[PDB]
mmCIF file of C-alpha atoms in Angstrom:
data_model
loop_
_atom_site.group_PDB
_atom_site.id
_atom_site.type_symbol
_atom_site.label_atom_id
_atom_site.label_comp_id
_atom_site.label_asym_id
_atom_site.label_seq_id
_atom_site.Cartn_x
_atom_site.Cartn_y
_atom_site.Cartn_z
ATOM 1 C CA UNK A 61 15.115 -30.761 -3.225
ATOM 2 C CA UNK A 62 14.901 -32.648 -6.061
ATOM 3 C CA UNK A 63 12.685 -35.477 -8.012
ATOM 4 C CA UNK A 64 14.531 -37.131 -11.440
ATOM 5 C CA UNK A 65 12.191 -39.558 -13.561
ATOM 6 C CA UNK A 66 13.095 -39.920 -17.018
ATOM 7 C CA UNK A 67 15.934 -38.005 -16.772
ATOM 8 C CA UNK A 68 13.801 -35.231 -16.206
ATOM 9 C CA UNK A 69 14.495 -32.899 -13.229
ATOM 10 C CA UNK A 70 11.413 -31.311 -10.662
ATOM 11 C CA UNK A 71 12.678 -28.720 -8.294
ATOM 12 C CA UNK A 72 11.037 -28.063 -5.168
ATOM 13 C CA UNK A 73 7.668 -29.294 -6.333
ATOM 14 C CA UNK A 74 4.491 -28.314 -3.487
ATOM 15 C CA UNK A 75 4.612 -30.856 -0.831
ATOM 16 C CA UNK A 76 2.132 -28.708 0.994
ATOM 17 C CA UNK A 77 -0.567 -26.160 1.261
ATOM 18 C CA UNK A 78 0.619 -22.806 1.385
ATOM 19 C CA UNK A 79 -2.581 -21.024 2.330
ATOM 20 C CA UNK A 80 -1.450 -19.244 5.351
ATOM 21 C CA UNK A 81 1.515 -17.697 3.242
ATOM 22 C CA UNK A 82 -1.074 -16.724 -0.241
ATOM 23 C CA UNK A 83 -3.431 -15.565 2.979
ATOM 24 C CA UNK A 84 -0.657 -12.979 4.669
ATOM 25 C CA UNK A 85 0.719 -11.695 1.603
ATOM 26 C CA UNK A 86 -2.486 -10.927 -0.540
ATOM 27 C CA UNK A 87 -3.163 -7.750 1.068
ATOM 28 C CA UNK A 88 -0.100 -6.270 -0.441
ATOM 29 C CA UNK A 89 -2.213 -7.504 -4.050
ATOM 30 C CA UNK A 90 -5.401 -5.791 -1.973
ATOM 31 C CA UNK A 91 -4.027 -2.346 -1.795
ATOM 32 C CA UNK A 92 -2.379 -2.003 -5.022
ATOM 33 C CA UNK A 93 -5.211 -3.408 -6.414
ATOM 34 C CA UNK A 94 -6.958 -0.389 -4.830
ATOM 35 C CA UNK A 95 -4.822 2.360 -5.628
ATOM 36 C CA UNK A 96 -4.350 1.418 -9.698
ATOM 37 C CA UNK A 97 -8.189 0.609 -9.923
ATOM 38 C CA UNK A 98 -8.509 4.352 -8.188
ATOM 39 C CA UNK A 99 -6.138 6.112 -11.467
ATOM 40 C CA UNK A 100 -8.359 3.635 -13.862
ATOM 41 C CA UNK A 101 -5.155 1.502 -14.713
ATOM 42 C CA UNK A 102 -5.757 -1.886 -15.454
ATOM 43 C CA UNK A 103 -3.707 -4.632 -13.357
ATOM 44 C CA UNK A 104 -2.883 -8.051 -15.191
ATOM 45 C CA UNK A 105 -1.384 -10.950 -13.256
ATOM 46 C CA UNK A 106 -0.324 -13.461 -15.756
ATOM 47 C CA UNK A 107 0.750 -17.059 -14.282
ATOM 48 C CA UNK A 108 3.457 -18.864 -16.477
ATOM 49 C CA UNK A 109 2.980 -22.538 -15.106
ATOM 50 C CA UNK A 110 6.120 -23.969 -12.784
ATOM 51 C CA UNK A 111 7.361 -26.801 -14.154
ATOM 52 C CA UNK A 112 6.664 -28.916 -11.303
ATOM 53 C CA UNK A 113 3.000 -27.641 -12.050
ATOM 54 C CA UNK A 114 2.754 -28.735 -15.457
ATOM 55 C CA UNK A 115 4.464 -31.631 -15.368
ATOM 56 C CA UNK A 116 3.130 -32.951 -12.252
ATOM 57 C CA UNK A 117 1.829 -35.996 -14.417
ATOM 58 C CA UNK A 118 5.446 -37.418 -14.165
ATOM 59 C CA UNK A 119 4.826 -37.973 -10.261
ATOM 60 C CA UNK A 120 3.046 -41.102 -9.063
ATOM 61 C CA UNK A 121 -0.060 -40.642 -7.271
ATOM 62 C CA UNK A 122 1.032 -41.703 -3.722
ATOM 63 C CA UNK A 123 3.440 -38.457 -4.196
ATOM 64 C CA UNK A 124 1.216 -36.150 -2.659
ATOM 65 C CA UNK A 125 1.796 -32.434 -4.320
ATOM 66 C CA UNK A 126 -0.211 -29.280 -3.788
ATOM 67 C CA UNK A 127 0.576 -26.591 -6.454
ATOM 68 C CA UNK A 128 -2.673 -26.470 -8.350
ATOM 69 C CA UNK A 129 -4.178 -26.282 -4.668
ATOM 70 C CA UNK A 130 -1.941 -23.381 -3.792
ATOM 71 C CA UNK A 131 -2.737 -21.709 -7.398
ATOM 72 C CA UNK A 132 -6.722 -22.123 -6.848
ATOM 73 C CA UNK A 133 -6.583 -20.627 -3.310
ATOM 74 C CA UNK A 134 -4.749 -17.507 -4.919
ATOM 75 C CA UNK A 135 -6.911 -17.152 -7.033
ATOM 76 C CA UNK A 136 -9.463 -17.656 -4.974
ATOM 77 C CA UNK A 137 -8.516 -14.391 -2.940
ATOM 78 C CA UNK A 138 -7.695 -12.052 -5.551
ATOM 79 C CA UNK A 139 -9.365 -8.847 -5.492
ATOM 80 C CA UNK A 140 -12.148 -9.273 -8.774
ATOM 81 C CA UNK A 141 -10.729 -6.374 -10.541
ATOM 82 C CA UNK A 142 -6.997 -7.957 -10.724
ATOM 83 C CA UNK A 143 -7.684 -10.041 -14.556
ATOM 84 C CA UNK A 144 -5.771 -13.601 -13.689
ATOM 85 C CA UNK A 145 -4.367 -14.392 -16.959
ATOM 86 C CA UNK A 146 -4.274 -18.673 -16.347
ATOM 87 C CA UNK A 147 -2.067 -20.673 -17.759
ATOM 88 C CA UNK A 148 -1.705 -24.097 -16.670
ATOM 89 C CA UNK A 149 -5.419 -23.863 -16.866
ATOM 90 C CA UNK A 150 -5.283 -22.877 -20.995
ATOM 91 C CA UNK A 151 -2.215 -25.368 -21.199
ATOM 92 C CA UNK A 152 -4.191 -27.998 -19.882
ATOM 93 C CA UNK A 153 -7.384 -27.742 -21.722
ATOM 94 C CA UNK A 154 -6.020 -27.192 -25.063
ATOM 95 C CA UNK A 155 -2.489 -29.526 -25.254
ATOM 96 C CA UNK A 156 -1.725 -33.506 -24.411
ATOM 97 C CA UNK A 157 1.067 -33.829 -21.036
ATOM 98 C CA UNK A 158 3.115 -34.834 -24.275
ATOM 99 C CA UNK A 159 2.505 -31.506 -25.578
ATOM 100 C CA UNK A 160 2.890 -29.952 -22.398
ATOM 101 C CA UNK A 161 5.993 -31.552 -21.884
ATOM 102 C CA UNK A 162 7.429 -30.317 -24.892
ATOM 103 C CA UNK A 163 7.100 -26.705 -23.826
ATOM 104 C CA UNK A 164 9.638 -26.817 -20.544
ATOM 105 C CA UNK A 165 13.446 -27.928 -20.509
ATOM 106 C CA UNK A 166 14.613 -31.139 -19.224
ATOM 107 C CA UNK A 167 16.678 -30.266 -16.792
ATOM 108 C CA UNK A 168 16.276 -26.493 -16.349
ATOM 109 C CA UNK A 169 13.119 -25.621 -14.420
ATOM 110 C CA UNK A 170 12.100 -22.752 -16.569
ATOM 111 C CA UNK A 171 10.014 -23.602 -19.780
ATOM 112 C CA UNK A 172 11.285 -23.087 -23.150
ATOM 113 C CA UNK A 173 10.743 -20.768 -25.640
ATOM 114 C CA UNK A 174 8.019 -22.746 -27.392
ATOM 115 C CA UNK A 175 6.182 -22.416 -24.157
ATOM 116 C CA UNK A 176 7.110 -19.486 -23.164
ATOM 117 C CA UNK A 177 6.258 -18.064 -26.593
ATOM 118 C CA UNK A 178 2.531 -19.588 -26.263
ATOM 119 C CA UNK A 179 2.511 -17.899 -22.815
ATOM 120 C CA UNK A 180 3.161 -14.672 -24.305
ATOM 121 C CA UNK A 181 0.886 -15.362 -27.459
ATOM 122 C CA UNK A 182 -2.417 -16.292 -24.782
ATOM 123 C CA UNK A 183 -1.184 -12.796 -22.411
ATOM 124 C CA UNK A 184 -1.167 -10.604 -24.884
ATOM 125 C CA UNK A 185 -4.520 -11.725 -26.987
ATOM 126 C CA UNK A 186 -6.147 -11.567 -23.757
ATOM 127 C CA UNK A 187 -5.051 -8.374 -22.996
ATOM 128 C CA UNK A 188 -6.077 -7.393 -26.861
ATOM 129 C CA UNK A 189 -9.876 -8.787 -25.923
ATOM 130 C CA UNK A 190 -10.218 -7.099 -22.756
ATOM 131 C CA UNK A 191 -8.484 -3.834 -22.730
ATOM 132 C CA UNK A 192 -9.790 -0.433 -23.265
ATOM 133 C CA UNK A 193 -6.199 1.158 -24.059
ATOM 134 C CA UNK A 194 -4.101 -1.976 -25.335
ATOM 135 C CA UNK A 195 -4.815 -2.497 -28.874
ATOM 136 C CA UNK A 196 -2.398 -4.429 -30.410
ATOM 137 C CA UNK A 197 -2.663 -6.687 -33.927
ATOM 138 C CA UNK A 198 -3.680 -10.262 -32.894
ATOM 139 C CA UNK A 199 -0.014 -12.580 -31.809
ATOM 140 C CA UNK A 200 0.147 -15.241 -34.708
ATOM 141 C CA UNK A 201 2.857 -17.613 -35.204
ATOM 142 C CA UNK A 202 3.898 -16.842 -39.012
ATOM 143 C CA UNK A 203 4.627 -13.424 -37.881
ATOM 144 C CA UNK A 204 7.695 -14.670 -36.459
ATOM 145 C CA UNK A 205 10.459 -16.848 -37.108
ATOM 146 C CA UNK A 206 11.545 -19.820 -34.755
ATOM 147 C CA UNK A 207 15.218 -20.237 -35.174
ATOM 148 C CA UNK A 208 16.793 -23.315 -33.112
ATOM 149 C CA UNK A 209 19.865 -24.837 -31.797
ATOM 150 C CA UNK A 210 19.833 -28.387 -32.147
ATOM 151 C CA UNK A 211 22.158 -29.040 -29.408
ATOM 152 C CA UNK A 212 22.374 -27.026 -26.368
ATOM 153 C CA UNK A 213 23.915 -27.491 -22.692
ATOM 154 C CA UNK A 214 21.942 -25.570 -19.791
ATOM 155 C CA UNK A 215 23.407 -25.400 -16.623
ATOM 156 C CA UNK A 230 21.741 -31.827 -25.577
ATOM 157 C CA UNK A 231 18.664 -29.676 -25.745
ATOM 158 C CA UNK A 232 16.893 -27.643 -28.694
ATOM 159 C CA UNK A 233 17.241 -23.843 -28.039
ATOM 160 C CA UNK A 234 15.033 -21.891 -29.954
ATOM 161 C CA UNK A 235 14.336 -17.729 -30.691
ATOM 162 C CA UNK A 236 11.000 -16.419 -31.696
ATOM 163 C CA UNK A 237 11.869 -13.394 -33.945
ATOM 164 C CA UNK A 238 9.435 -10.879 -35.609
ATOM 165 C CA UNK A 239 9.734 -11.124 -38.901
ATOM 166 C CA UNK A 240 11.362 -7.554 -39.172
ATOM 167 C CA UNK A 241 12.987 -7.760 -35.987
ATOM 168 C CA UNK A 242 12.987 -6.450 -32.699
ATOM 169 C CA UNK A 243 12.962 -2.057 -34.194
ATOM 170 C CA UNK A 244 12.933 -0.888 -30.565
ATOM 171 C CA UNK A 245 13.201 3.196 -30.324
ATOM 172 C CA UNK A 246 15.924 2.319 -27.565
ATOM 173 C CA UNK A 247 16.199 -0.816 -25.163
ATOM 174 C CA UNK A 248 17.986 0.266 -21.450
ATOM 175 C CA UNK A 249 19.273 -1.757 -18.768
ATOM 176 C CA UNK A 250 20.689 -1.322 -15.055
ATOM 177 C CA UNK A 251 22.460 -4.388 -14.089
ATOM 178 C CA UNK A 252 22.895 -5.407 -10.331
ATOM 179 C CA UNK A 253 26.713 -3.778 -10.463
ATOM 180 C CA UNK A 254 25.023 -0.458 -11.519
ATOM 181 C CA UNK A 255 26.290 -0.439 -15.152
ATOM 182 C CA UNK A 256 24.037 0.340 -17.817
ATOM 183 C CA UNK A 257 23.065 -1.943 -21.001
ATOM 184 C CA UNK A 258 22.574 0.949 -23.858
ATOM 185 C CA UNK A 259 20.839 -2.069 -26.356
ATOM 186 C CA UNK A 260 18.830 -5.060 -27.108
ATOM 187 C CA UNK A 261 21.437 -7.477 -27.936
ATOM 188 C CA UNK A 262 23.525 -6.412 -24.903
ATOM 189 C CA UNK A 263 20.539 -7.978 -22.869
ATOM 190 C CA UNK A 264 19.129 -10.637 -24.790
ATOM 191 C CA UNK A 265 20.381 -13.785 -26.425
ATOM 192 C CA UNK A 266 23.691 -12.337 -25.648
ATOM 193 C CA UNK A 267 25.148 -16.078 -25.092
ATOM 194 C CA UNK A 268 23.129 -17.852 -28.093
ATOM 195 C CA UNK A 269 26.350 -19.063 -29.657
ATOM 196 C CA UNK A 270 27.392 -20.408 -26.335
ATOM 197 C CA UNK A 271 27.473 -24.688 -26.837
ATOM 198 C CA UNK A 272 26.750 -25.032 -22.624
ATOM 199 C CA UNK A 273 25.531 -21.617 -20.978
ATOM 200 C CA UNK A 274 22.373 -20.778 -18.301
ATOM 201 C CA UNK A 275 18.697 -19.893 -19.249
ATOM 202 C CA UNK A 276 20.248 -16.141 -18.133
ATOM 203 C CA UNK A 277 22.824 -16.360 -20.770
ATOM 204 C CA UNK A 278 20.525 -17.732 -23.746
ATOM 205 C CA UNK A 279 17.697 -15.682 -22.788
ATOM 206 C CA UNK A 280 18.227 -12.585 -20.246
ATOM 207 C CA UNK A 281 19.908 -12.700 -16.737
ATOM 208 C CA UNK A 282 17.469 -11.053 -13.812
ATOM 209 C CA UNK A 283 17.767 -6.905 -14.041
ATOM 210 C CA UNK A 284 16.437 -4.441 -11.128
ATOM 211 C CA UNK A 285 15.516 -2.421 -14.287
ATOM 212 C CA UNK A 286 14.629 -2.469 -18.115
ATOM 213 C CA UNK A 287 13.687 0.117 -20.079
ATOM 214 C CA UNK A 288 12.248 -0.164 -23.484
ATOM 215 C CA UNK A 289 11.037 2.812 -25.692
ATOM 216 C CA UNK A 290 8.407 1.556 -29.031
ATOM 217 C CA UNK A 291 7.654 4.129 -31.347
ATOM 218 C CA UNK A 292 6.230 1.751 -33.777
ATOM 219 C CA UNK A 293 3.156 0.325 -31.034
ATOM 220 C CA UNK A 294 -0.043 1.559 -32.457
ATOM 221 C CA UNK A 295 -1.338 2.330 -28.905
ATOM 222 C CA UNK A 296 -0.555 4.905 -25.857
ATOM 223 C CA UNK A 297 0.497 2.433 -23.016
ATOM 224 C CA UNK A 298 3.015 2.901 -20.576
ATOM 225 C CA UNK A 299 3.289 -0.859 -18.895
ATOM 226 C CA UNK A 300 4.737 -1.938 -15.943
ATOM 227 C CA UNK A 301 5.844 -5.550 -16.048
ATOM 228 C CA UNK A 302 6.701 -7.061 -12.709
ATOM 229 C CA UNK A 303 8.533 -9.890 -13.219
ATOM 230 C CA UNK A 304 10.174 -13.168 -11.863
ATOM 231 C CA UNK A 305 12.740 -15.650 -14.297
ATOM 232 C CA UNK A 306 9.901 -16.843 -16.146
ATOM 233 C CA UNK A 307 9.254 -13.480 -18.286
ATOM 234 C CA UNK A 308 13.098 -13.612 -19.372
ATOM 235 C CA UNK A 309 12.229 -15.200 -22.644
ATOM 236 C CA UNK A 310 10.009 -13.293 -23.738
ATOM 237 C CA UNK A 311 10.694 -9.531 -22.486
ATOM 238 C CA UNK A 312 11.145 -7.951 -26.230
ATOM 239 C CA UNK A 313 8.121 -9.841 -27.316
ATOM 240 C CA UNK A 314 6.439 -8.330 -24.543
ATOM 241 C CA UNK A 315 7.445 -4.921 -24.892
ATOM 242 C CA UNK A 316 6.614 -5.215 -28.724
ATOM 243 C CA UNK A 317 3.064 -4.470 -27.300
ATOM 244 C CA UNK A 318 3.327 -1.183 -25.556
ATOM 245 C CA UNK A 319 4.446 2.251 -26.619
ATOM 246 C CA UNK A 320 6.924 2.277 -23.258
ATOM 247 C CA UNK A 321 7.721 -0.885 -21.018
ATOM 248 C CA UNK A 322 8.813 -0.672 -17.633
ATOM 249 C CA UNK A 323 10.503 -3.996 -16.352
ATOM 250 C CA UNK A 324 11.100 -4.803 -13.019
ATOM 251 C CA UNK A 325 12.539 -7.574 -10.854
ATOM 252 C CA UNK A 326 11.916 -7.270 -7.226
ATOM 253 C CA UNK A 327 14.298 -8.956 -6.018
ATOM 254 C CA UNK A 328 16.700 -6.272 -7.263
ATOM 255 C CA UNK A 329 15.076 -3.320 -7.466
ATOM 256 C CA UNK A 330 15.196 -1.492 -4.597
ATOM 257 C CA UNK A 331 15.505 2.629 -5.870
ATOM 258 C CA UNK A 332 12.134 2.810 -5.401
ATOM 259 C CA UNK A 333 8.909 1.460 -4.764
ATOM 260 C CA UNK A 334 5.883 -0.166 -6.484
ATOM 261 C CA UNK A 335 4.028 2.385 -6.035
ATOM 262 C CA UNK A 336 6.515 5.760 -6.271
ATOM 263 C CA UNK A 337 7.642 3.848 -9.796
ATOM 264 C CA UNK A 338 4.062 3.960 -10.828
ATOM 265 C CA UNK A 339 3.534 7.489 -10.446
ATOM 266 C CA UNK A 340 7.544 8.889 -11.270
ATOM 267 C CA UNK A 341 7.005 6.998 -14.720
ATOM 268 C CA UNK A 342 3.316 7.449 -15.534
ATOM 269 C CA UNK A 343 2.631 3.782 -15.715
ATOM 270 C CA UNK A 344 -0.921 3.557 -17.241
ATOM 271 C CA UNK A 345 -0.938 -0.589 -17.261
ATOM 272 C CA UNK A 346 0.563 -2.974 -15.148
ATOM 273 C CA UNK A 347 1.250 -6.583 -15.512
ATOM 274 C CA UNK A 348 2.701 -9.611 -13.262
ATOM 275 C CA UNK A 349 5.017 -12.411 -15.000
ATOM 276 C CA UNK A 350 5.419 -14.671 -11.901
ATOM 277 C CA UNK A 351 5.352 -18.744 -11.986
ATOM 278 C CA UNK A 352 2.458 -20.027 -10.617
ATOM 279 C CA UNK A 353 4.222 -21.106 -7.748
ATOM 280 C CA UNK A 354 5.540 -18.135 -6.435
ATOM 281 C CA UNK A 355 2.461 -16.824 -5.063
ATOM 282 C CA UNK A 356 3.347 -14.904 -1.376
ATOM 283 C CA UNK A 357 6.824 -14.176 -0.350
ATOM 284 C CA UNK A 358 9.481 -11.089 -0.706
ATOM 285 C CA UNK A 359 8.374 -10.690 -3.971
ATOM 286 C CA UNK A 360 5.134 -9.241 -3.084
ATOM 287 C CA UNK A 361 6.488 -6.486 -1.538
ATOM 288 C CA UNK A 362 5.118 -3.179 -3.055
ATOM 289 C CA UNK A 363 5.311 -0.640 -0.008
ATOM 290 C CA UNK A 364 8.289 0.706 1.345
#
């Protein structure tokens, strides 16, 4: 389902309350919530904005939609010692809907990497503030270097990278596709399609994996993260893993070897953090327990 203004596209926008779905799947949140806060391992759950969230602003008023209702009564229920990391909330205080608008794709329902580079800039300094094992320098734009395409086709656009300023010098960068093969480095997973004149949001940025693996000998810090992930972390997965000594990524959807919870402990995860859209807040991919 689908709402087209300006020639920009809203996908499946909240048409109603989802309480009784947040409601039945926030245990699952309860008892991991439990068992990290048990092995003193802090649990993040960051919440990049869904486009239909942001941009809501492009909907008349009469067209009745409930995400920011949905997000409120998440976070409503979250146990106190999961640390929200808020998005749409920053987003909103601290940019115009013009600004805003600017940070998502037209057409594509993800936002871009302007956005999604903010949303990893706010995560990790808030992480930085709060921690007591991430320490990390301070994210600042002229450490990096935005390189764009002027003219892109997602299944024209601008198409931009964030790059550190000495590159992405990851110790090693693994990958276990769906088909079972394995991706041995960072360019075989990332940007692989950035020459591409018409390609998917997978193909510029990174498709979904059941598994990444990255390895940072250069992180001035002991953490072994966990990311748990939907689409919306895709962008920014190296700039993530910049952070920690070892990252751990994870889509649910495809990762199946194991659980939540046996990953934790077969990997030593020390930190764990959620990259879902603020709009996928109960479902399949809140399934931790086997």
């Amino acid at each position: 389902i689908i709402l087209t203004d300006d020639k920009w596209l809203l996908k499946n926008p909240a048409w109603t309350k989802k309480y009784n779905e947040i409601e039945q799947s926030m245990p699952a949140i309860n008892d991991l919530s439990q068992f990290l806060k048990e092995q003193n391992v802090e649990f993040y759950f960051a919440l990049p904005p869904s486009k239909t969230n942001a941009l809501s602003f492009k909907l008349p008023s009469h067209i009745h939609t409930y995400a920011q209702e949905n997000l409120n009564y998440f976070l409503k229920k979250l146990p106190a010692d999961v640390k929200p990391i808020k998005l749409m909330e920053h987003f909103k205080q601290n940019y115009t809907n013009e600004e805003i608008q600017d940070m998502y794709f037209k057409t594509d329902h993800h936002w871009n990497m302007d956005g999604a580079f903010l949303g990893y800039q706010y995560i990790m300094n808030t992480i930085g503030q709060q921690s007591s094992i991430y320490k990390g320098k301070e994210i600042a734009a002229a450490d990096y270097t935005r390189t764009c395409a002027q003219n892109k086709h997602l299944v024209g656009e601008k198409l931009c990278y964030y790059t550190p300023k000495d590159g992405f010098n990851f110790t090693s960068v693994t990958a276990k596709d769906v088909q079972g093969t394995v991706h041995q480095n960072l360019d075989e997973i990332y940007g692989v399609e950035a020459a591409a004149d018409t390609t998917s949001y997978a193909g510029y940025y990174t498709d979904d994996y059941p598994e990444i693996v990255i390895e940072n000998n250069n992180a001035q810090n002991e953490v072994r993260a966990l990311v748990l992930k939907d689409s919306f972390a895709n962008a920014i997965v190296p700039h993530l893993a910049q952070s920690f000594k070892h990252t751990s990524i994870l889509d649910l959807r495809h990762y199946h070897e194991k659980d939540v919870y046996q990953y934790i402990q077969d990997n030593n995860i020390n930190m764990v953090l959620f990259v879902y859209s603020d709009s996928n807040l109960s479902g399949d991919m809140f399934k931790f327990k086997k």
